[PDB]
Scaffold this active site. Structure first.
Site, PDB file in Angstrom:
ATOM      1  N   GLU B 209       0.875  -1.160   0.004  1.00 55.82           N
ATOM      2  CA  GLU B 209      -0.102   0.041  -0.108  1.00 55.82           C
ATOM      3  C   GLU B 209       0.966   1.016   0.039  1.00 55.82           C
ATOM      4  O   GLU B 209       1.657   1.443   0.891  1.00 55.82           O
ATOM      5  CB  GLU B 209      -0.820  -0.207   1.224  1.00 55.82           C
ATOM      6  CG  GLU B 209      -1.798  -1.257   1.080  1.00 55.82           C
ATOM      7  CD  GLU B 209      -3.270  -1.276   0.608  1.00 55.82           C
ATOM      8  OE1 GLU B 209      -3.318   0.203   0.260  1.00 55.82           O
ATOM      9  OE2 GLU B 209      -3.963  -2.069   0.330  1.00 55.82           O
ATOM     10  N   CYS B 243      -2.871   9.001   3.113  1.00 55.56           N
ATOM     11  CA  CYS B 243      -2.316   8.442   1.952  1.00 55.56           C
ATOM     12  C   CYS B 243      -3.177   8.929   0.929  1.00 55.56           C
ATOM     13  O   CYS B 243      -2.988   8.840  -0.213  1.00 55.56           O
ATOM     14  CB  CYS B 243      -2.145   6.916   2.325  1.00 55.56           C
ATOM     15  SG  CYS B 243      -3.889   6.330   2.537  1.00 55.56           S
TER      16      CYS B 243
HETATM   17  C1  LIG Z   1      -3.574   4.982   3.846  1.00 55.47           C
HETATM   18  C2  LIG Z   1      -4.819   4.906   4.828  1.00 55.47           C
HETATM   19  C3  LIG Z   1      -5.115   6.162   5.526  1.00 55.47           C
HETATM   20  O1  LIG Z   1      -4.245   6.890   5.823  1.00 55.47           O
HETATM   21  C4  LIG Z   1      -6.265   6.377   6.235  1.00 55.47           C
HETATM   22  C5  LIG Z   1      -6.976   5.220   7.126  1.00 55.47           C
HETATM   23  C6  LIG Z   1      -8.173   5.428   7.671  1.00 55.47           C
HETATM   24  C7  LIG Z   1      -8.838   6.505   7.407  1.00 55.47           C
HETATM   25  C8  LIG Z   1      -8.382   7.665   6.644  1.00 55.47           C
HETATM   26  C9  LIG Z   1      -7.214   7.558   6.038  1.00 55.47           C
END
Ligand SMILES: *CCC(=O)c1ccccc1
Ligand SMILES: *CCC(=O)c1ccccc1
Ligand SMILES: [K+]
Ligand SMILES: [K+]
Ligand SMILES: [K+]
Ligand SMILES: [K+]
Lengths: 447, 452
Positions: B209, B243
Site C-alpha cells: 500500500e 495516504c
Molecule cells: C492510507 C490509509 C489512511 O491513511 C487512512 C486510514 C483510515 C482513514 C483515513 C485514511
C-alpha cells in the site's frame, strides 16, 4: 534494441486506447481461434518435433484447452467487464458503489517448454480479454514451437500490441529490464525468484506458476485398479513432463506390490511392451534433462523400466520401489517418467511427510473414504487438490489454477484470468448536494 | 536474536494448529475489541503525543474503523471460511468442485506512522481472521504508539502467535530476512521495492500500500461551496498526512479564485482564524518532515497560510496558486497541509496530466455531470476513485482498498482481507469408481482422426 522497440510499440499502441472496446478484444480472440484452426498441422508438427507429441494428444492434452478458454471468454466478456455494483450501508444509500475493471497496460507472458502452446497462449488469451497489450517470450527449449509462434502470431494478431520476443536466457534477462504492468511466468521455483526480483524494480505485480513435487497418497483399502490407471495416465503423459504430474506415491507398505503390478498393467495397456514404439509416448525435451532424469534412476531399485536412449531422449516408463526420501529422486521435481514409491505407515505419517516439505503445486489422494480426503485436505496446503484423479482439476473453468509458497503465487483460468490481468478499482460516486448527515464529520469536534 | 526467536515462536505456534478453529480466531478478535475499549485513553494519549490528535479524531478518524472491521469479520467469518462450491460441467456433474480457504502461515504486517493504530491493527485483524500467526512491526516515527502497542498487544492477544517487533530500519531489515508466508507493507513507493525484493527470496506474496499524488479535479460547472468544504476536510485532516488526501487540485483558471475563497472559508470554520489554536488541527510527525514540507512552500505564490513553527512542527493550512507542475511541491507526495492548485484548460487536459504521471492511490473528481465522471474514470487508472467526496471510499466494507502501479499491489478491508491472507485452494473430489466416460483420454489414441 529490438526488445526495447517492441515493448515501446506495444505500450504506445495500448496508450492509444485501441484495446479498450470489447469489440477489438473479441476480434483478436477470434483471430486466435482462426490461427488454431488454420495452423493445426503446423502446431502438431512443432509439438511432435519438440516433445514427440502426435496429432491426437497435441489437441486433446494441450491445444483444446486454449480453444475452450477463448470461446468461454468471448461469451462472458461483456458480463465480466461490466461495472460491478457492491453492497451499500444505510449511510451510503444515495451513493453509487461499484468495482470498475480496467486493463493493467502491457503484460509480459513468459512461456515454458513442456506445453509450449498452452502455457504461452492460454495466459495470453486472458490478458487480451482484459484489454492489455501482451508481449510473449516463448521458451527457447521448445525450439520448433518458439519459431512457429514468432511466425504465426503476427500473421493473425495486431503486430504492435502482441509481439513475440525471440531468444534464450540473455534475451529474457534483457526483456525483464523493460517496464511491464504485470508478468505471468511459468517455470521453476528458482527462476520465479529471479522474475519477482526483476519485477520489484518496476513494482510490477506477478503471477508465478512454479514447481514442487506433487505428492500422491494412495489409501490402503481403495480400488487400486481404478486408482493406478488414473495415476499412470497423469504420470506418464508428456513423458512425465507436467507441472501437476503426480510426482511420487506415498502408500502403506502392504499395498506397494499391488501398486507396482497395477501400474505395470496400465502402462502396458497404454504403450505396449516397448514404449519406445508407442506413438502416444513422449520424449524428454533436451540432452541436459535426459541426463538429469537418468541420473535419478541411479542407485534405485527398478521394478519396471529403467532404461533410456540418449540419442532420441527416450526414457522407458520406470517405477522405483522402497525409495529413500533422502535420495536424489526424492529431493527434486522429477519432471520425467520415473515414479518412486515411498512407504508410510499411516495417514498421519503421510500428512507429516507432505507438511515437512515445500508446498506443492498439486496434492493428490486416492481413497474411497471421504473423511480421509477431508482430513488430508484440512491438514496440508498445496496449490490445488484432486481426490481420486490427477491433472483434471487444472483444466476446469471454475477452478483457478495456481500455487502457494514455493509452487507460486496468483492464479488464472476463466474468470480468474480476467481478474488477474485487470486492475479492480473501487469506486464511490456521491451526489454533490449538501448533506446534513455528513456535517458531524467536520471540525470543530464536539466536546 | 530477539527477532529470530519471535518469528520462530510464531511459526511453532502456527504449526501447533491452534489458529485453525474459528473459535480461537473469534476469541483473539474479541480480545482486540477489549483492548480498544480498555485502552481508549492510552490510545488517545499516544496519538495526541505523536500527531496532536484529540479524543474525538483519535476515534472517528482512526480507531472506529478497526472496531467496525473486527465486528464485521467476526459476524462473517464462518461464511467466508466455508468451503465454496463452484460451477460444474457435464463431465464433472458427479464430482465435488470447490474452493478451500486456508491460512498462509506467518504474516508480517509492517505499519506506518500517520495512522499508527489503524495501519498496524486493521491489517492484523484480517490476518488473524484468516487463521495466521501475525508479526507486527510498528513505525518508530510514531514513537508513542509504537511503544504502547508493544506493551498492550501481548496483554490481550496470544503471546507467541502475535509478537510486536521494536526498532527502526535496521531491525526491519533484519526482520525481512526471516521467512514469512505474506507481507503487508504500508508506506513509500521506494521502500515497497525493497520489501518486494526481500520477499522474493522466499517467494513471499506481498500486499503493498504505497504512495503517489492523488489528484483532485474540480469541474467548472459544479457547486464549489459543497466541493471545497469536502476537499478542505480531506486535505487538512491529520495535518495533510493521509495516504488518500487530495494532494493537489486541477481546475480551470476561471474558477481558481473562487476555489481559494471557499477553501479559506471552510478552513476558518474548521479551525478558526488561527489554526495553531485549534484542538482539531494536527502537527507534522517529525523534524525531518517539517523541514521537507516547509521547503515545498519556497518560491511559490501563497494564497493563504504559508508559515510554520519549527518548535511545535505546526504548519499553517496553506494554499498555493498558479503552481508550476515541474516545481518541488508538484514533484513529490506532499503529505502536509500545503495545497497547490494547478491549472488545466479542460477535462481532457486534466486526464492527460494525470495519465502522464504515476498511477495514484486515489483519484478524485468534483462534478455534477455524469458523463464527466464516467469519462475521467474510463480514461485514467488509480487505486480507487471517489466522485464528489474524498477519503470515504476507503472506509467501506464493500470496497477493497489498494493501489495500482507505483501506488501499490494487492488490497484489503472486509472480505478482501480474509482472501488476501488466505490461500484459496481449488479442489476436485471424484468418486473412485469406474467411469466409462474417462476411457477416451487413455492411450492408445485413436489411429484415425475425426473432426473436432
Ligand atoms: C492510507 C490509509 C489512511 O491513511 C487512512 C486510514 C483510515 C482513514 C483515513 C485514511
Ligand atoms: C503447468 C500446467 C501444465 O503443464 C498443463 C497445461 C495444459 C494441460 C495439462 C498440463
Ligand atoms: K530403494
Ligand atoms: K461539525
Ligand atoms: K466461503
Ligand atoms: K482410450
Amino acid at each position: 534494441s529490438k526488445i526495447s522497440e517492441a515493448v515501446k510499440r506495444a505500450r504506445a499502441a495500448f496508450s492509444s486506447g485501441r484495446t479498450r472496446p470489447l469489440q477489438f478484444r473479441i476480434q483478436q480472440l477470434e483471430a486466435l481461434q482462426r490461427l488454431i484452426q488454420e495452423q493445426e498441422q503446423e502446431l502438431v508438427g512443432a509439438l511432435a518435433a519438440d516433445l514427440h507429441k502426435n496429432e491426437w494428444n497435441a489437441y486433446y492434452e494441450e491445444v483444446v484447452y486454449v480453444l475452450e478458454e477463448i470461446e468461454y471468454m468471448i461469451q462472458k466478456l461483456p458480463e465480466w467487464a461490466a461495472d460491478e455494483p457492491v453492497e451499500k450501508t444505510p449511510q451510503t444509500q444515495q451513493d453509487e458503489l461499484y468495482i470498475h475493471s480496467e486493463p493493467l497496460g502491457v503484460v509480459l507472458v513468459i512461456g515454458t517448454w513442456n506445453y509450449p502452446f498452452n502455457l504461452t497462449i492460454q495466459p495470453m488469451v486472458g490478458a487480451i480479454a482484459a484489454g492489455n497489450a501482451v508481449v510473449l517470450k516463448p521458451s527457447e527449449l521448445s525450439e520448433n514451437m518458439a519459431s512457429l509462434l514468432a511466425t504465426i502470431i503476427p500473421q493473425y494478431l495486431d503486430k504492435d500490441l502482441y509481439p513475440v520476443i525471440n531468444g534464450g536466457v540473455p534475451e529474457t534477462t534483457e526483456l525483464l529490464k523493460e517496464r511491464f504492468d504485470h508478468i505471468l511466468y511459468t517455470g521453476s521455483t528458482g527462476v520465479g525468484k529471479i522474475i519477482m526480483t526483476a519485477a520489484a524494480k518496476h513494482l510490477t505485480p506477478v503471477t508465478l506458476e512454479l514447481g514442487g513435487k506433487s505428492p500422491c497418497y494412495v489409501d490402503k483399502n481403495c480400488d487400486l485398479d481404478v486408482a493406478c490407471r488414473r495415476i499412470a495416465w497423469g504420470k506418464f503423459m508428456n513423458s512425465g513432463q507436467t507441472c501437476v504430474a503426480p510426482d511420487y506415491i506415498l502408500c502403506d507398505p502392504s499395498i506397494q506390490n499391488q501398486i507396482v503390478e497395477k501400474l505395470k498393467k496400465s502402462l502396458k495397456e497404454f504403450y505396449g511392451e516397448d514404449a519406445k514404439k508407442s506413438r502416444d509416448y513422449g520424449r524428454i525435451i533436451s540432452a541436459r534433462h535426459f541426463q538429469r532424469v537418468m541420473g535419478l534412476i541411479e542407485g534405485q531399485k527398478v521394478a519396471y523400466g529403467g532404461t533410456g536412449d540418449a540419442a532420441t531422449r527416450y526414457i522407458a516408463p520406470t517405477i522405483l520401489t522402497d525409495v529413500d526420501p533422502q535420495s536424489p529422486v526424492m529431493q527434486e521435481e522429477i519432471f520425467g517418467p520415473v515414479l518412486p514409491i515411498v512407504c508410510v505407515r499411516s495417514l498421519e505419517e503421510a500428512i507429516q511427510f507432505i507438511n515437512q516439505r515445500e508446498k506443492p503445486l498439486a496434492l493428490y489422494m486416492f481413497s474411497s473414504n471421504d473423511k480421509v480426503i477431508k482430513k488430508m485436505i484440512a491438514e496440508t496446503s498445496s496449490g490445488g487438490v484432486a481426490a481420486n484423479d490427477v491433472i483434471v482439476h487444472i483444466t476446469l473453468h471454475s477452478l483457478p489454477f495456481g500455487g502457494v509458497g514455493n509452487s507460486g503465487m496468483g492464479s488464472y483460468h476463466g474468470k480468474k484470468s480476467f481478474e488477474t490481468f485487470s486492475h479492480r478499482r473501487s469506486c464511490l460516486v456521491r451526489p454533490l448536494m449538501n448533506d446534513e448527515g455528513l456535517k458531524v464529520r467536520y471540525p470543530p469536534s464536539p466536546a
